[PDB]
Scaffold this active site. Structure first.
Site, PDB file in Angstrom:
ATOM      1  N   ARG B 104       0.776  -1.245   0.000  1.00  0.00           N
ATOM      2  CA  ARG B 104       0.000   0.000   0.000  1.00  0.00           C
ATOM      3  C   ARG B 104       0.807   1.295   0.000  1.00  0.00           C
ATOM      4  NH1 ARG B 104      -2.464  -0.663   4.357  1.00  0.00           N
ATOM      5  NH2 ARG B 104      -1.703   0.915   5.842  1.00  0.00           N
ATOM      6  N   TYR B 125       9.891 -11.552   9.043  1.00  0.00           N
ATOM      7  CA  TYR B 125      10.656 -12.718   8.626  1.00  0.00           C
ATOM      8  C   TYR B 125      10.797 -13.700   9.777  1.00  0.00           C
ATOM      9  CZ  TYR B 125      14.071 -15.288   5.797  1.00  0.00           C
ATOM     10  OH  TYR B 125      14.662 -16.268   5.037  1.00  0.00           O
ATOM     11  N   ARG B 180      13.720 -26.152   1.956  1.00  0.00           N
ATOM     12  CA  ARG B 180      14.033 -26.140   3.371  1.00  0.00           C
ATOM     13  C   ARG B 180      13.702 -24.845   4.095  1.00  0.00           C
ATOM     14  NH1 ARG B 180      19.124 -24.652   6.700  1.00  0.00           N
ATOM     15  NH2 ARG B 180      17.774 -22.816   6.363  1.00  0.00           N
ATOM     16  N   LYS B 198      12.867 -11.737   3.241  1.00  0.00           N
ATOM     17  CA  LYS B 198      14.311 -11.539   3.321  1.00  0.00           C
ATOM     18  C   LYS B 198      14.680 -10.187   2.699  1.00  0.00           C
ATOM     19  CE  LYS B 198      18.172 -13.770   4.554  1.00  0.00           C
ATOM     20  NZ  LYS B 198      18.330 -14.582   5.798  1.00  0.00           N
ATOM     21  N   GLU B 270      18.513 -18.756  -0.478  1.00  0.00           N
ATOM     22  CA  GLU B 270      17.883 -18.886   0.830  1.00  0.00           C
ATOM     23  C   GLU B 270      16.990 -20.125   0.949  1.00  0.00           C
ATOM     24  OE1 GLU B 270      16.901 -16.951   4.754  1.00  0.00           O
ATOM     25  OE2 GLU B 270      18.368 -16.456   3.199  1.00  0.00           O
ATOM     26  N   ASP B 271      17.095 -20.801   2.090  1.00  0.00           N
ATOM     27  CA  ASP B 271      16.298 -21.983   2.393  1.00  0.00           C
ATOM     28  C   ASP B 271      16.319 -23.168   1.426  1.00  0.00           C
ATOM     29  OD1 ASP B 271      15.706 -20.841   4.761  1.00  0.00           O
ATOM     30  OD2 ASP B 271      13.535 -20.741   4.513  1.00  0.00           O
ATOM     31  N   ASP B 293      23.038 -17.133   2.712  1.00  0.00           N
ATOM     32  CA  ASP B 293      22.954 -16.662   4.087  1.00  0.00           C
ATOM     33  C   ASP B 293      22.911 -17.773   5.138  1.00  0.00           C
ATOM     34  OD1 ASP B 293      22.570 -14.344   5.977  1.00  0.00           O
ATOM     35  OD2 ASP B 293      20.749 -15.474   6.422  1.00  0.00           O
ATOM     36  N   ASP B 294      22.184 -18.854   4.851  1.00  0.00           N
ATOM     37  CA  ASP B 294      22.065 -19.966   5.798  1.00  0.00           C
ATOM     38  C   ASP B 294      23.417 -20.547   6.162  1.00  0.00           C
ATOM     39  OD1 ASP B 294      19.155 -20.179   6.093  1.00  0.00           O
ATOM     40  OD2 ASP B 294      19.177 -20.702   3.959  1.00  0.00           O
ATOM     41  N   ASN B 433      16.741 -23.762  17.020  1.00  0.00           N
ATOM     42  CA  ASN B 433      15.511 -22.980  16.979  1.00  0.00           C
ATOM     43  C   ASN B 433      14.296 -23.906  16.893  1.00  0.00           C
ATOM     44  OD1 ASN B 433      16.937 -20.295  16.575  1.00  0.00           O
ATOM     45  ND2 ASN B 433      17.587 -21.339  14.700  1.00  0.00           N
TER      46      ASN B 433
HETATM   47  N1  LIG Z   1      20.013 -20.344   8.836  1.00  0.00           N
HETATM   48  C1  LIG Z   1      20.085 -21.490   9.496  1.00  0.00           C
HETATM   49  O1  LIG Z   1      19.972 -22.500   8.786  1.00  0.00           O
HETATM   50  C2  LIG Z   1      20.279 -21.540  11.003  1.00  0.00           C
HETATM   51  C3  LIG Z   1      19.903 -22.636  11.823  1.00  0.00           C
HETATM   52  N2  LIG Z   1      20.086 -22.654  13.171  1.00  0.00           N
HETATM   53  C4  LIG Z   1      19.658 -23.850  14.007  1.00  0.00           C
HETATM   54  O2  LIG Z   1      20.691 -24.839  14.036  1.00  0.00           O
HETATM   55  C5  LIG Z   1      20.097 -26.135  14.279  1.00  0.00           C
HETATM   56  C6  LIG Z   1      20.789 -27.188  13.419  1.00  0.00           C
HETATM   57  O3  LIG Z   1      20.592 -26.932  12.009  1.00  0.00           O
HETATM   58  P1  LIG Z   1      21.236 -27.864  10.897  1.00  0.00           P
HETATM   59  O4  LIG Z   1      22.830 -27.888  11.085  1.00  0.00           O
HETATM   60  O5  LIG Z   1      20.893 -27.322   9.435  1.00  0.00           O
HETATM   61  O6  LIG Z   1      20.618 -29.289  11.083  1.00  0.00           O
HETATM   62  P2  LIG Z   1      21.480 -30.488  10.594  1.00  0.00           P
HETATM   63  O7  LIG Z   1      20.512 -31.718  10.256  1.00  0.00           O
HETATM   64  O8  LIG Z   1      22.314 -30.113   9.286  1.00  0.00           O
HETATM   65  O9  LIG Z   1      22.491 -30.899  11.764  1.00  0.00           O
HETATM   66  C7  LIG Z   1      22.101 -31.397  13.055  1.00  0.00           C
HETATM   67  C8  LIG Z   1      23.325 -32.035  13.710  1.00  0.00           C
HETATM   68  O10 LIG Z   1      23.065 -32.362  15.093  1.00  0.00           O
HETATM   69  C9  LIG Z   1      23.357 -33.754  15.300  1.00  0.00           C
HETATM   70  N3  LIG Z   1      22.407 -34.316  16.277  1.00  0.00           N
HETATM   71  C10 LIG Z   1      21.038 -34.616  16.277  1.00  0.00           C
HETATM   72  N4  LIG Z   1      20.383 -35.148  17.361  1.00  0.00           N
HETATM   73  C11 LIG Z   1      21.495 -35.248  18.276  1.00  0.00           C
HETATM   74  C12 LIG Z   1      21.637 -35.672  19.686  1.00  0.00           C
HETATM   75  N5  LIG Z   1      20.729 -36.174  20.405  1.00  0.00           N
HETATM   76  N6  LIG Z   1      22.900 -35.661  20.299  1.00  0.00           N
HETATM   77  C13 LIG Z   1      24.077 -35.125  19.657  1.00  0.00           C
HETATM   78  N7  LIG Z   1      24.161 -34.669  18.354  1.00  0.00           N
HETATM   79  C14 LIG Z   1      22.754 -34.688  17.597  1.00  0.00           C
HETATM   80  C15 LIG Z   1      23.220 -34.411  13.943  1.00  0.00           C
HETATM   81  O11 LIG Z   1      23.911 -35.648  13.807  1.00  0.00           O
HETATM   82  C16 LIG Z   1      23.806 -33.347  13.041  1.00  0.00           C
HETATM   83  O12 LIG Z   1      25.232 -33.383  13.009  1.00  0.00           O
HETATM   84  C17 LIG Z   1      18.569 -25.985  14.028  1.00  0.00           C
HETATM   85  O13 LIG Z   1      17.791 -26.177  15.218  1.00  0.00           O
HETATM   86  C18 LIG Z   1      18.450 -24.592  13.408  1.00  0.00           C
HETATM   87  O14 LIG Z   1      17.194 -23.972  13.698  1.00  0.00           O
HETATM   88  C19 LIG Z   1      20.652 -21.595  13.799  1.00  0.00           C
HETATM   89  C20 LIG Z   1      21.069 -20.445  13.082  1.00  0.00           C
HETATM   90  C21 LIG Z   1      20.875 -20.426  11.674  1.00  0.00           C
HETATM   91  O1  LIG Z   2      -4.579   3.896   8.526  1.00  0.00           O
HETATM   92  C1  LIG Z   2      -3.408   3.540   8.314  1.00  0.00           C
HETATM   93  O2  LIG Z   2      -3.108   2.344   8.333  1.00  0.00           O
HETATM   94  C2  LIG Z   2      -2.332   4.575   8.014  1.00  0.00           C
HETATM   95  O3  LIG Z   2      -2.675   5.814   8.658  1.00  0.00           O
HETATM   96  C3  LIG Z   2      -2.216   4.781   6.491  1.00  0.00           C
HETATM   97  O4  LIG Z   2      -2.455   5.893   5.990  1.00  0.00           O
HETATM   98  O5  LIG Z   2      -1.891   3.844   5.749  1.00  0.00           O
END
Ligand SMILES: NC(=O)C1=CN([C@@H]2O[C@H](COP(=O)(O)OP(=O)(O)OC[C@H]3O[C@@H](n4cnc5c(N)ncnc54)[C@H](O)[C@@H]3O)[C@@H](O)[C@H]2O)C=CC1
Ligand SMILES: O=C([O-])C(O)C(=O)[O-]
Ligand SMILES: NC(=O)C1=CN([C@@H]2O[C@H](COP(=O)(O)OP(=O)(O)OC[C@H]3O[C@@H](n4cnc5c(N)ncnc54)[C@H](O)[C@@H]3O)[C@@H](O)[C@H]2O)C=CC1
Ligand SMILES: NC(=O)C1=CN([C@@H]2O[C@H](COP(=O)(O)OP(=O)(O)OC[C@H]3O[C@@H](n4cnc5c(N)ncnc54)[C@H](O)[C@@H]3O)[C@@H](O)[C@H]2O)C=CC1
Ligand SMILES: O=C([O-])C(O)C(=O)[O-]
Ligand SMILES: O=C([O-])C(O)C(=O)[O-]
Lengths: 602, 602, 592
Positions: B104, B125, B180, B198, B270-271, B293-294, B433
């Site tokens: 808007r 995001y 992902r 993003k 991304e993702d 970024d990931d 997370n």
């Molecule tokens: N942009 C991103 O992708 C970001 C992700 N994160 C968080 O990081 C976490 C991990 O992400 P990924 O590396 O992509 O997943 P992933 O599947 O690539 O890696 C997970 C790792 O943890 C290990 N693991 C699992 N269960 C286990 C346990 N009980 N004991 C010990 N080791 C264990 C696995 O073997 C693996 O090495 C997620 O919870 C994610 O939300 C945090 C910041 C950024």
């Molecule tokens: O009402 C509203 O959401 C705002 O004041 C706008 O002008 O967009």
């Protein structure tokens, strides 16, 4: 529409390798569909095909009924144009017809001009354009250029003016303040036709995309009293501004143009007053992507003619002695370019100058002259003063005689004879324009040398037939250089254009002179070959520039020649309607992908 | 209108030198006047101010009567938006309201988001966007992104799709195949909201011009059975394509994007699925202006948190030992980034690895493991196998404990206690997370260390108050890095983004952590400071890149900081009407410049 | 794109005689190709089909990539919309969804509303629109109406505001000053939703082309103190202006509209305070193509109910006696219309007025009134002053009892019983809105009558079963009349709309009531039959107006019905790409 296993507009192609095919698809031009329709589309020169539009095209795009019920091919259209062109009463009327054609059907315009380059180049630019600016004054036409004046002095004011220009992808700008329209003088705001015509050649001879071109005229006033007294003059009615204010406008101009279109924007200066033109070139050459055709282009194309001569006198540029009759802008620029070329050949600058002699209205420039131009200091000769061409000839026995002095027939029989006595194949260049100012005609140069002279002129002379042997004297036309130098500079985003690059362009022009023409005393390629020459120059510039890291296009294209050939303008009509193509049948289906029970209502 | 001796829009400016003034005029943004009017203008988010339009503006632009008779300031408008935002029933409804606001009034959107960044970032995001994509499915809105599918596989087909995008000056592209979506998985064609969100952050946090942003979703199918069974799924209804065809689409994609917008176009991934994402990064990193970024952003921001910790543990990154609980994408990426950072500190890669220990679902990664990931080869430890965090801790006595394993509360009291025994100020990072998967909460890390632990988390935790001392645990948010890395990359046309640059960004984030926050256990700057941090990162990247010649912007701007500050997005409403200005009175006169006798008629 | 011997878009045409073919080509809608492409086209509700666009259309029009990779049928899209609609938390939420739909895909919007009329009409307008205006305030949407204020008071100033409207071919305008939004009161500038919803019905129920519609809200201030004190209010923040300035703003408005779009422009007034509503109607009625639905539409749709009733009471309106409980704007307007209907049946304005009895807060309106309303004078009965309906009933022995008084349950068993005593099939109308204010419910009307009562209400009541008999009480909804009156007026450029035309519309609605509906006690047609009713009314209006020479459309079309059906809005998607056709081969060849 195209089959699901085919690509759009990829029919009837030459056999290609898996690698070749990919490179072709990467470089090739993609279809661009317009937003305009009906009259608005017909009024856009870049889209309008006129009666060249098929019935289906006219119906789809909303043009049907707005055009006559006749359908033509671009060839039939070009025939109609050339026919009417030749039926015109004079060249000024042809200029008017051609300017109108450019505003009507751009593709056709270039088709016609490219097909009859020798016959139309002198109408589009060369000498008719200046005459048209002077005699017609304000010429009715579509906005094809911009006027930036001394009263729009600031980056922002100039920026806003550029913002009024329709095209946003501007890459080539030709600017003039209209002070020195070649052969006419100060025409002020009437000089707008010069940049227009120059750019028309960038496209027709260089292959530069027309949408990248922007003609500009800077108006700071005029010192032409006839215009200031003319109740029909349409420029600022005051004398030319010249202080820091003029220098500020030009600085603000270069800034605004680059701030708006990018630092790589090519800005070329045309028809400025000689001293002013040289000053500006020295100030911007290394700061922006700029060059001045009058200075660098002239110097360059003549060096090209001389280089070609080498193949006949069997004497390298560094193994020859040159005598210039006249030492103004042209001669001085040419001489300096010859010095650079000789150094690149092995000789020292000191010895390079020693083979160059300059004569001006006062006579031979000697080390013992009162007050001489700085640029002449290194050419001044340690010899006795004189006003006789014959005395200077006999003393230096030059191998080449170059005239760039507005003096008609200054190269008389005695002078020509002298040259054809110290040299087996005397090089005689009569560059003053027009032909009526030529130091000598081709007929005179060949007759007075028994057809052994290597002649070139600024203005075109008919073919000569002496004792069976036919001669086709050539013209040292800047058009042989600037298009290609502009093309290469744009396509590869060369940061700065220096002497080395113009020399490279000159060497390229020379290399394209065929034996069949050399046997007819021609030291310049045929005009119809400039498009190809331009491409060859563009590629050569890339090679040279990538080696010293001055080409900004990143990364260097895998196939320079192919990239360039896919980038140049195509005079052929293109499709304006989106190409359609299939998706796998099951993926183009309309309707629920998975069945559901229809809702119920009231 | 402005006086003839003044410049346009140059009123009430701070005192400036003749040099300063010129630099200001060179860099400053110029007014851009729209072509649209009335409803068409009101429907353009980048132009529409809503009731923020004054009465004069409404009358001039043809908007009068199409808006309610109330006039507001942007501040009053932002108040109305934030008020309604907080009255919303939940976060998904806030996401919908914010997505609508972006469609808007774009200026207002960013105004509101930038003003309440901590409160709105997780809506735009972070975690709400994924939930919205999953739960709402096809979301009604203005075309703010592009879908390029496996059935548009060719440079030309993709080119034509990009040609349908309104803006031609695209410089930043965020693409995803939707496999992902962080914390949700494969959502196929529903993932379009990720690139959108993003990019909204690129603008709000980095200062990147919104017109340069282009969100893209590649659709090659989905392996999410719920979607393939869903009668409301709007993507290609088939499983994901993965052969040479997928690799071809991506290649054709990078080609088309660069062929269309230029080689300097920033394309960020991304993702994508972890393995696929890493593969693509390795294939394009050095060929295009791309980054993921990931992978790189995550690794980078954590290193920034650790670098900051250094200022407390008094131990350099190269003087510390790190233990990672989990060794997937996140941990591995972070560890590798730590290795690079340690080398740049003087240590060898060999010794760098020795200070890094990895544990995964099987336990400690030892040199004697059956089949381990190649990227783990250099981290494998020459030690006894085990599954006990406590045993690994006691054996290596790491100084920092980093968890990137989806296991909730894996960092129990005993583990925390252990860390706060071998170290005076133990570094504990619970990155999984959302908070519900955190290896430990902030409250637990501080309580079980008597408030001496240096804690950071992936998901935000409330402030903690233990024995008087207040603690503000920080979040290792990628938003601290990518905006600035994107900004610097765009503004200076950096050819490629490597580890060194992310490290530079990380060092910059660390340097902005204030003492007032460090005393509250905060190892990350406040979110509201990212805009400034982004600018500082952009300038630093320029310095670094000009030194090794990787910045393509030519020439290097005289004042890096000023150039950047003049380039960033301004959330303030701008004038849409051309500024007018006087010419010398005599030059603006209408009528014959020189008198003539009027003609006669019938 | 089409053979040289064929006409464009003429395939699969029903069998037709040379003449029928000619008339069909003359009246049929022609294709209109747009100028917009890509997002611009997708952002235009009148063009956008959303995922309904085929792959080829998307490629041709530059939409490909801007839409998800799914192709739908319009029916499929309507299903998706109804699903989300039924999943909404409340009607207000459905209102917002529908408002967004009209702003997204116009053809789909009308396809959905038209398919579920009974379900959505009350969301589009009726009772939901007013509550949305009150509760939401300035809702976000594409510009879909014009705000003209007391500060833009000149023909030129208003003309410029109208010039800011996209469509140049405006033919129908609905305007309100928002002072009296039905059921809610003075909502000031928030009342722009009323004209919008009203026009939505013009299209959905009347078949009026959407491009001809222009919603307008006149803002002269507001007396709603809450809004004036509400920092979020967005209309002029001051009390309403009523002096000469108001009257002048209205005069300039009528002048500017007709100057901009022509004297043929239909301008309908809606939700104006009752005094201004009547005054403005009396003043503009014979000077412009104008009317007021609250006054005329109400009176007309009610007379239509009473007409259908004569079919069961074997008593023409002129042979009937009517008692109105409440004599405000509604009751008085209906009476005046009934009288007019009586005069047309032969009777004199003498008997007519003598056949109608009025009552208000101060009981029966008798000749012995101290300061009675001018419009009542001719109805004021010369009899004893009472307050009891029963006393009036027993005295005048009315065949019909009509209630337009905000008093709930005014018609108690005693009152109803008394009517079912004097009449075999007593006419009982409880017009007060909402149902919580109806003089009496259907269940009451029937029960206390044995199902012999001819009942109708202003608001909806569920079906009632009594003694194994199912009753379906009808609603005197203005929607049965204005869409048709609008269509006829617009299409045949009728100079002015008068009682006879409304009566004609009233008679048409009455005639479309089937016997089966009548056996179920329903004295109004089915809501889904309104589009057809509107077409019939337009045709009937043309016949009447061509006879008295008040239809400016020249010349009278040969086949009125075929003509009307070719003009009404079509909800199905149309081609946006030019049809192409061949020319003789010899004549398309390029080159010499
Ligand atoms: N942009 C991103 O992708 C970001 C992700 N994160 C968080 O990081 C976490 C991990 O992400 P990924 O590396 O992509 O997943 P992933 O599947 O690539 O890696 C997970 C790792 O943890 C290990 N693991 C699992 N269960 C286990 C346990 N009980 N004991 C010990 N080791 C264990 C696995 O073997 C693996 O090495 C997620 O919870 C994610 O939300 C945090 C910041 C950024
Ligand atoms: O009402 C509203 O959401 C705002 O004041 C706008 O002008 O967009
Ligand atoms: N783009 C261009 O500007 C080109 C111009 N030319 C032609 O070159 C000629 C010269 O141009 P400019 O150098 O700009 O003029 P100029 O004014 O700069 O130089 C003329 C020179 O000739 C000398 N001169 C004049 N009368 C003389 C005489 N009687 N005897 C001996 N020396 C004499 C002058 O002293 C001066 O050195 C013109 O006729 C022009 O048409 C040719 C090719 C390109
Ligand atoms: N388009 C419209 O405006 C329509 C309105 N209605 C309904 O008609 C009803 C009345 O509307 P208006 O005439 O505009 O209001 P109004 O204010 O003009 O008329 C009300 C009348 O009822 C009388 N009255 C009030 N309390 C009474 C009592 N206890 N006993 C006897 N008489 C009493 C008043 O004196 C007055 O004559 C409302 O409920 C309205 O919703 C029905 C159909 C259409
Ligand atoms: O007539 C012409 O000049 C030509 O055929 C054209 O179509 O422009
Ligand atoms: O989802 C919908 O609301 C419908 O299918 C549409 O295309 O608008």
């Amino acid at each position: 529409s195209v089959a699901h296993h085919e690509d759009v507009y990829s029919h009837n192609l030459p056999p290609m390798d898996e690698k070749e095919m990919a490179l072709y698809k990467l470089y090739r031009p993609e279809r661009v569909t317009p937003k305009k329709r009906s009259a608005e589309l017909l009024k856009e020169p870049r889209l309008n095909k006129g009666m060249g539009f098929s019935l289906y095209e006219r119906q789809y795009l909303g043009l049907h009924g707005l055009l006559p019920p006749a359908f033509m091919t671009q060839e039939q259209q070009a025939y109609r144009v050339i026919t009417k062109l030749r039926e015109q009463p004079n060249d000024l009327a042809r200029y008017i017809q051609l300017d109108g054609l450019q505003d009507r059907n751009e593709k056709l315009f270039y088709r016609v001009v490219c097909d009859h380059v020798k016959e139309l180049m002198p109408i589009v630019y060369t000498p008719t354009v200046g005459l048209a600016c002077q005699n017609f004054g304000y010429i009715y036409r579509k906005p094809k250029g911009l006027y930036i004046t001394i009263n729009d002095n600031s980056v922002s004011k100039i920026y806003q003016i550029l913002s009024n220009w329709h095209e946003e992808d501007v890459r080539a700008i030709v600017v003039t303040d209209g002070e020195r329209i070649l052969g006419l003088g100060d025409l002020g705001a009437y000089g707008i036709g010069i940049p227009v015509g120059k750019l028309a050649l960038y496209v027709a001879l260089g292959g530069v995309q027309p949408k990248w071109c922007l003609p500009v005229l800077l108006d700071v006033g005029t010192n032409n009293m006839d215009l200031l007294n003319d109740p029909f003059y349409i420029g600022l009615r005051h004398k030319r501004v010249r202080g820091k204010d003029y220098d500020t406008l030009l600085d603000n101009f270069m800034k605004a143009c680059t701030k708006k279109y990018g630092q790589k924007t090519l800005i070329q200066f045309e028809d400025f007053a000689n001293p002013n033109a040289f000053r500006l070139l020295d100030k911007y050459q290394d700061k922006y992507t700029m060059f001045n055709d009058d200075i660098q282009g002239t110097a360059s194309v003549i060096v090209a003619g001389l280089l070609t001569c080498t193949r006949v006198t069997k004497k390298l540029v560094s193994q020859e002695k040159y005598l210039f009759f006249g030492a103004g802008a042209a001669s001085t620029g040419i001489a300096e370019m010859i010095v650079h070329q000789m150094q690149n050949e092995g000789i020292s600058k000191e010895e390079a100058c020693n083979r160059i002699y300059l004569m001006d209205i006062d006579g031979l420039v000697t080390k013992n002259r009162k007050e001489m131009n700085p640029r002449h200091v290194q050419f001044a000769k340690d010899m006795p003063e004189t006003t006789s061409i014959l005395e200077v000839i006999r003393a230096a026995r030059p191998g080449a005689l170059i005239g760039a002095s507005t003096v008609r027939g200054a190269f008389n029989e005695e002078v020509i004879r002298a040259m054809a006595e110290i040299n087996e194949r005397p090089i005689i260049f009569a560059l003053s324009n027009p032909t009526s100012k030529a130091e000598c005609t081709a007929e005179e140069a060949y007759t007075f040398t028994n057809g052994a002279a290597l002649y070139a002129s600024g203005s075109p002379f008919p073919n000569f037939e002496l004792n069976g042997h036919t001669y086709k004297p050539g013209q040292g036309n800047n058009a042989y250089i600037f298009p290609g130098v502009a093309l290469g500079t744009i396509l590869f985003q060369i940061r700065h254009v220096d002497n080395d690059l113009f020399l490279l362009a000159a060497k390229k022009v020379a290399s394209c002179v065929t034996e069949d023409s050399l046997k007819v005393g021609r030291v310049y390629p045929q005009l119809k070959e400039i498009r190809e020459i331009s491409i060859q120059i563009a590629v050569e510039m890339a090679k040279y520039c990538y080696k010293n890291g001055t080409a900004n296009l990143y990364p260097q294209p895998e196939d320079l020649e192919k990239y360039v050939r896919a980038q140049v303008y195509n005079t052929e009509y293109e499709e304006l309607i989106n190409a359609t193509y299939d998706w796998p049948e099951q993926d183009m289906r309309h309707g629920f992908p998975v069945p559901v029970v229809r809702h119920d209502s009231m």
